[PDB]
Design an enzyme around this catalytic site. Structure first.
Site: not given
Ligand SMILES: NC(=O)c1ccc[n+]([C@@H]2O[C@H](COP(=O)([O-])OP(=O)(O)OC[C@H]3O[C@@H](n4cnc5c(N)ncnc54)[C@H](O)[C@@H]3O)[C@@H](O)[C@H]2O)c1
Ligand SMILES: NC(=O)c1ccc[n+]([C@@H]2O[C@H](COP(=O)([O-])OP(=O)(O)OC[C@H]3O[C@@H](n4cnc5c(N)ncnc54)[C@H](O)[C@@H]3O)[C@@H](O)[C@H]2O)c1
Ligand SMILES: [Cl-]
Lengths: 365, 365
Positions: A276-277, A229, A94, A75, A279, A201-202, A129
């Site tokens: 989790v997103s 979706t 940041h 950080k 946003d 995703g992750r 990333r």
């Molecule tokens: N809440 C937290 O603490 C925290 C921590 C880290 C990351 N995040 C956030 O989590 C989110 C995802 O992280 P990630 O690393 O898994 O990203 P990622 O790219 O690995 O996974 C994104 C997934 O969602 C899919 N996707 C995108 N738009 C879509 C839609 N309209 N319909 C269906 N699927 C869709 C993509 O194809 C992909 O498989 C990001 O916003 C990231 O910043 C949150």
């Protein structure tokens, strides 16, 4: 013969580490020399770095360290600090997206003849990333999702899931979720169906990983990504699921996944939304049924519905903090290929892109 | 409390295993009971499996094993076996794409009331394979590509790269390649530039890995995927590279990546093409510069050119067999989460899709 010096974290609460004992040891095998600062807030014991071949040095000793050492930390640095930064640094600074004082930040580097390689902008050639905290955010998110659904089965509507704290390792988290989950089943509740949008995703992956470990049947876990979706929401499969977990990196505008009128239905099964997103301030937020960013001390917030059972959102923006040891291991391991390439930082495009991004941003002051 | 029974491979020269001593040990910890056949042709020592906790049984034991055990193997049954197949079998059986004898194979299951779960149609909900052999294909391909490029520095045009043979491990293959690479650099050759199309996939990542382990600068490795090729072919960068590695998964016609006209050029630097995809028979083939499918004993084929230096193709379609150990570890690790759902195979979609596929092809006889 690259030298790396692991800076102790000073942001309070922050327990994750950018290098873990395991990667320190891999790095030493490759001929790196590694200094590690003694940090009592780190979830890793200093002894673990010592067994791994690290040279143990005092907290803060980076400041006076020779300028051949690469300073790696996770950080951003204290605001109090105003002195010139002379080393190459690896860290999340940041300061590339107009966060106030981002100019002060870069100023310290400019005056020091120092370099910032920003973890947040280490990308492969196609813009992905190399190292993020996704998996364990999704893992931790799912786990509170289950504890919330379970709490709604064993307690009255007027109690909220209490304040949650981090776990020292994954096995301790899983046991606690498992215990709460089994308690829920004893009341005669159906095993939850859990809908995850963005499952590939992750974070989606971590969510899925948690659910298996906890014991939710695989057929109970619905796994949607882009193709599922693509027609556009709202989706009836949301009110019908017990738990909905939104993973997903939002870019395009996109229609909402669900809304207040579809959720006001007495046949709604959905107890728990785990965003989790997170946003929430985004004007194209696919789930605009809440405003509060929840936190550890208050992990859930009510969705005021006129009909159906009590529905809550989790929207913690720091989920991987629930599990600092595992979030640090997966992230360091994600980062390590690029770390191995530090001896080539002056030509390897992962490192050159990050230096150029730095260049671009200093030109801006 | 699933039981799994690891059948000895009978296919000539097949040294890989579906389960490694390492995933056996992880499966035992989840409470699986695992029997391992003692294999003449496997790359693992039976002791390794014994010390992971497998029960050791003779070759061929699966034929009369109780019908509670799930028989897991890798390759196809002998064509000459005709007895009824009574068990639940997990393997690549190759009878879904109309291979000569596909009915005979299915008939053995129908007569026995057995069940085939075909390793090739194990996929997630979005239709992507859970376990394939991509990485060590790309890794072994790249080794061979770097070793061919290098041979052309140190030997004469009338000589071709000698026959290769499987290695007991990665380190050994890497030591050979490095040595041949070192000698090639003594001749004043330029460090080769290696272009990888399909770089992000499994074989691409394997190819990148080898290249790093042999000390090819990261900046010399051009890692191209779907974004980089959208403009469509031919691509001038291909003749300009020393080595080109095709790791694409080809799923629709696309303009060729290069051709003889572009290859027939005094200026061309391209020495070695490694077609890991090896889609020679396919009409969409994006590198139709060659017609022959090379093999270990004869691993390059000449591309005849009217201008430029000697060019060869490597088009071996069983690259993972050169590192049977590592190939097995990476396969078994990817398959592992799925094997963990076997208690739930009657409802877990990944297994239900495979059972469903089987019932479809059976109805066909
Ligand atoms: N809440 C937290 O603490 C925290 C921590 C880290 C990351 N995040 C956030 O989590 C989110 C995802 O992280 P990630 O690393 O898994 O990203 P990622 O790219 O690995 O996974 C994104 C997934 O969602 C899919 N996707 C995108 N738009 C879509 C839609 N309209 N319909 C269906 N699927 C869709 C993509 O194809 C992909 O498989 C990001 O916003 C990231 O910043 C949150
Ligand atoms: N020769 C062997 O011994 C051997 C062994 C296993 C697999 N294979 C072959 O390897 C090929 C790929 O294996 P994989 O596991 O790496 O596939 P993969 O799906 O994991 O990766 C394929 C990559 O190709 C990319 N891609 C697809 N089309 C492209 C295009 N037109 N331009 C640029 N990039 C493109 C995809 O985005 C993906 O990243 C397959 O055709 C398979 O048949 C060969
Ligand atoms: Cl149930």
């Amino acid at each position: 013969a690259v030298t790396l010096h692991l800076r102790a974290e000073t942001k309070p609460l922050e327990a994750r580490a950018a290098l873990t004992p395991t990667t320190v040891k891999k790095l030493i095998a490759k001929g790196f020399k590694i200094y590690v600062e003694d940090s009592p807030q780190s979830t890793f014991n200093i002894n673990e770095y010592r067994q791994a071949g690290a040279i143990i040095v005092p907290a803060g000793s980076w400041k006076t360290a020779p300028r051949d050492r690469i300073i790696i930390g996770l950080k951003e640095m204290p605001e109090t600090d105003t002195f010139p930064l002379v080393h190459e640094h690896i860290q999340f600074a940041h300061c590339y997206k107009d966060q106030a004082g981002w100019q002060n930040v870069l100023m310290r580097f400019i005056k020091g003849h120092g370099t910032l390689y920003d973890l947040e902008f280490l990308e492969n050639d196609q813009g992905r990333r190399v190292a993020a905290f996704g998996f364990y955010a999704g893992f931790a998110g799912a786990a509170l999702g289950v504890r919330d659904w379970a709490f709604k089965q064993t307690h009255s509507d007027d109690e909220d899931l209490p304040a949650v704290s981090p776990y020292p390792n994954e096995k301790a988290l899983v046991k606690d979720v498992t215990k709460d989950y089994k308690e829920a089943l004893a009341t005669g509740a159906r095993k939850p169906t859990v809908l995850i949008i963005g499952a590939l995703g992750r974070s989606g992956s971590g969510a899925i990983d948690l659910l298996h470990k906890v014991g939710i049947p695989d057929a109970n876990i619905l796994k949607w990504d882009i193709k599922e979706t693509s027609r556009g929401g709202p989706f009836d499969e949301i009110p019908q699921a017990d738990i909905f977990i939104n993973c997903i990196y939002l870019s395009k505008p996109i229609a909402p996944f669900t809304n207040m009128e579809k959720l006001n239905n007495p046949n709604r099964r959905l107890r728990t939304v785990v965003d989790v997103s997170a946003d929430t301030t985004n004007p194209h937020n696919p789930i605009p049924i809440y405003t509060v960013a929840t936190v550890f001390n208050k992990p859930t917030v009510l969705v005021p519905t006129t009909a159906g059972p009590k529905l809550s959102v989790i929207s913690i923006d720091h989920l991987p903090s629930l599990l600092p040891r595992e979030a640090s291991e997966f992230f360091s391991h994600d980062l390590l290929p690029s770390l191995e390439l530090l001896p080539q930082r002056k030509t390897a495009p992962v490192w050159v892109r990050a230096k150029k991004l730095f260049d671009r941003h200093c030109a801006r002051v």
